[PDB]
């Protein structure tokens, strides 16, 4: 996996694979909803949509027609600390793909006509995510956990902010963040130097980063958000403090989440679903940021069973935080992580994505063997000691149901 | 693509790839919701779930622990005309994967205790799709279109039906269809001869098909279903006539769907979202069965623009049907399908599911060059013709909105 830093700060990270005939391209920008400010919330995500509305030589439709003629495997996503524009094409079209992706990045034409239009689509996107209780519930959890911090902002923004949005705000923001220190180009697959130099030549145009971004650290609080909505199930989320991206004990958290509810053999899947038959869907995942991080559990059960679910989950998170892991579980976790990782080496997007994300959020490149060592290097008590620190805390809580009132999740009686 | 048959009737379809370590095993069975009868509606799916609830050798938990130790890349699903069980494992564990899958297929005990708790998870699974308006509305459409025929019955079945499923009903069903003529083991990737022998020696045990299923042929009814649900968006589904699985002009249908709402540059995407910004989501897809088939359109918009949205979708489909598609559009589609197909070849789970599904439903296979020719051979004449026949029919409507009443705009449509 080669890496390259141009003079403006832009980084080109590449990985060649002869076994394939395709190639994944990704333009990773180091900004997201976290870097926004009250008034400009959603700007990152709007900009990501607006990047497909048209350039000086390619209109919205022409952009669409191009990517469709090459398979149609192009997508964009905005997270809390990075944004992404990527595509997958056959070797003989990478050049063109880069030209189109490039022109969209640099020469976009934020026409008011097209922008007034796109603002409406994003408004639908918001309502749609709203009509998906099992999805919006995860967003509320971030709001209850961080309150007014930018990490508690919904990535799509609000109807208010969006209405304030215009070409001015877009460019003002794009100018500060879409610069040298924040841009990373990731290419994986059947890449030829030609293409790489094309990328080099093109992304030199990226202006050096001059803006010094000042970021405040977040405070985790066990607050609660509830929403009254007409549903069959009670959608529930519990948040526990996690670790920040850089943290050395990340592999420890990965394994700890795997045991919690990150797999079939996970405590939650077995205790809550397989044995109690309470939830069809119950799982856990972790979110790691620059300064903060957090472990999340999701569960959904029929209303009439909500109180029982909270207790059952409580029991599961206790015997884990208290007693810890077992030797069989620790290794099962490792076999899984190593196994999935090995299996992902067949997907170009998978490598492209991994590479660009680590280079962007770790400023580091981790080889296979290197990542594998880490997994194996994890001792059984590293996880246990971690589960004791993280899973003991008072969790933040998110909930959506019919009566719209919190259940009986304040006392420890059963 | 080597295809072989055992005496009991089960077919073994395999495909060796040369730049992969993994292997994808898939147990296909030609039965699903279509083959069920009112009273056993949901049995096909509920069965797929019990296959993971334990056998004599290994328990539900040991089953979860095994697949987790090998990437966790396992899964299973049920459709209207087929069920599927698959995994992706590094070759050195492919034998073990087959051993576990066999035990489940043959020696899976449906204990009273497990069958009880698992009935609940499906009750939760059912409520979960219920809370997802953009998902269940598609099923409500299948219902309107096929009235009381099995093609209209939900995959997950009803709650009254599940409430009676006992080990007797399961085995009775299973002992009918899970036989030679319906079984098809598909393998793709780092396929070793040793694994193929282990497969033949195992799936030879399956009993020959004595039962002779005799089914009715569905009939398209331009019916409409409307469910009132407290939502933000009005979710619309419009179905039209399609074509049977192995019909003469399937590829013309694929290309038609592509121009309709099957891609970024489709008439629907460009008219409804790109120019008006009425929906964030607007698309179409074809559903083809062995004797029937339908073309489906989907769109989510705010409760107000439901009238506006309807007239709009109306124009597009109207104009497409009457005026056809341009050669540029037809050529843009072929490039898309061809390129899409190419990029998929890289995936093992992709080749396995394709071969298994083809054998099981079409019985015929085509090399990549044979597939690319079929895509090329399609003429604008063909596609535009089809567009008139299919899109000039009265469509079926499934709608979910705040009031639960049909829109005024839902009238004129000839």
């Amino acid at each position: 996996i080669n890496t390259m830093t141009l003079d403006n700060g832009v980084r080109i990270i590449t990985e060649k694979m002869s076994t394939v005939r395709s190639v994944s391209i990704g333009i990773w920008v180091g900004t997201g909803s976290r870097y926004e400010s009250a008034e400009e919330n959603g700007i990152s995500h709007f900009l990501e949509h607006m990047f497909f509305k048209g350039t000086n030589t390619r209109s919205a439709q022409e952009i669409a027609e191009f990517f469709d003629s090459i398979g149609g495997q192009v997508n964009a996503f905005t997270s809390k600390e990075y944004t992404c524009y990527y595509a997958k094409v056959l070797d003989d079209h990478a050049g063109q793909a880069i030209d189109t992706l490039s022109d969209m990045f640099f020469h976009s034409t934020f026409q008011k006509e097209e922008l007034e239009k796109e603002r409406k689509v994003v408004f639908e996107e918001i309502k749609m995510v709203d009509d998906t209780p099992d999805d919006i519930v995860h967003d509320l959890l971030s709001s209850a956990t961080y309150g007014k911090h930018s990490l508690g902002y919904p990535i799509l923004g609000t109807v208010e902010t969006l209405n304030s949005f215009n070409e001015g705000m877009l460019r003002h923001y794009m100018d500060r963040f879409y610069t040298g220190d924040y841009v990373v180009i990731s290419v994986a697959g059947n890449v030829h130097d030609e293409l790489i130099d094309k990328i080099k030549e093109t992304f030199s145009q990226v202006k050096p980063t001059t803006y010094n971004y000042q970021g405040e650290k977040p405070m985790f609080l066990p607050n609660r958000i509830v929403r009254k909505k007409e549903t069959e199930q009670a959608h529930l989320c519990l948040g526990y403090p996690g670790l920040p991206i850089g943290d050395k004990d990340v592999y420890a958290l990965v394994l700890l989440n795997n045991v919690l509810g990150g797999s079939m053999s996970s405590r939650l899947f077995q205790d809550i679903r397989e044995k109690r038959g309470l939830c069809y869907s119950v799982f856990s995942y972790h979110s790691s940021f620059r300064d903060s991080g957090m472990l999340t559990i999701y569960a959904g059960t029929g209303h009439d069973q909500l109180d029982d679910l909270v207790y059952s989950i409580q029991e599961t998170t206790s015997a884990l935080a208290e007693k810890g892991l077992t030797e069989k579980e620790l290794e099962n976790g490792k076999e899984q992580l190593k196994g999935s990782l090995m299996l992902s080496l067949e997907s170009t997007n998978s490598r492209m994505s991994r590479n660009g994300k680590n280079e962007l959020l770790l400023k580091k490149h981790r080889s296979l063997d290197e990542m594998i060592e880490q997994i194996n290097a994890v001792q059984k008590q590293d996880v246990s000691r971690l589960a004791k620190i993280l899973l003991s805390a008072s969790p933040s809580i998110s909930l959506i149901n019919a009566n719209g009132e919190l259940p009986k999740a304040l006392i420890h009686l059963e | 693509i080597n295809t072989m048959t055992l005496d009991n009737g089960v077919r073994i379809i395999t495909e060796k790839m040369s730049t992969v370590r993994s292997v994808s095993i898939g147990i296909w069975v030609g039965t699903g919701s279509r083959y069920e009868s009112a009273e056993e509606n949901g049995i096909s799916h509920f069965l797929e779930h019990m296959f993971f609830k334990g056998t004599n050798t290994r328990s539900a938990q040991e089953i979860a622990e095994f697949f987790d130790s090998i990437g966790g890349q396992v899964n299973a699903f049920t459709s209207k005309e087929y069920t599927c069980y698959y995994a992706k494992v590094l070759d050195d564990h492919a034998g073990q994967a087959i051993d576990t899958l066999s035990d489940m297929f043959f020696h899976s005990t449906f204990q009273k205790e497990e069958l009880e708790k698992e009935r609940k998870v499906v009750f939760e699974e059912i409520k979960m799709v219920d809370d997802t308006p953009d998902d269940i509305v598609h099923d409500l459409l299948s219902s309107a279109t096929y009235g009381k025929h099995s093609l209209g019955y939900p995959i997950l079945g009803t709650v009254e039906t599940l409430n009676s499923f006992n080990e007797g009903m399961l085995r009775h069903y299973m002992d009918r269809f899970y036989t030679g003529d319906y079984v098809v083991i598909s393998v793709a990737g780092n396929v070793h001869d040793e694994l193929i022998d282990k497969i033949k020696e195992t799936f030879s045990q399956v009993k020959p098909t004595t039962y002779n299923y005799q089914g009715e042929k569905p009939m398209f009814l331009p019916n409409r279903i409307v469910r009132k649900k407290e939502t933000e968006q009005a979710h619309l589904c419009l179905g039209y006539p399609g074509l049977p699985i192995g019909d003469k002009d399937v590829y013309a249908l694929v290309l038609l769907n592509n121009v309709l709402g099957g891609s970024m540059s489709s008439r629907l995407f460009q008219d409804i979202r790109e120019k008006r910004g009425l929906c964030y989501s607007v698309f179409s897809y074809h559903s083809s069965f062995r004797d029937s088939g339908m073309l489906t359109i989907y769109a989510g918009t705010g409760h107000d623009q439901l009238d506006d949205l309807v007239y709009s979708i109306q124009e597009t489909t109207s104009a497409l049907a009457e005026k056809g598609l341009t050669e540029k559009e037809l050529e843009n589609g072929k490039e898309q399908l061809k390129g899409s197909l190419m990029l998929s070849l890289e995936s093992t789970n992709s080749r396995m599911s394709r071969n298994g599904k083809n054998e099981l439903l079409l019985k015929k296979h085509r090399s990549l060059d044979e597939m690319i020719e079929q895509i090329n051979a399609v003429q604008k004449q063909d596609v535009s013709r089809l567009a008139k026949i299919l899109l000039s029919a009265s469509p079926s409507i499934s709608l979910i909105n705040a009031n639960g009443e049909l829109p005024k705009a839902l009238i004129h449509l000839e």
Partner: peptide, 14 residues
């Protein structure tokens, strides 16, 4: 590693 949160809702199109 990978940073895949929960249910997707920040992609480009449907």
């Amino acid at each position: 590693a990978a940073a895949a949160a929960a249910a997707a809702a920040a992609a480009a199109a449907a």
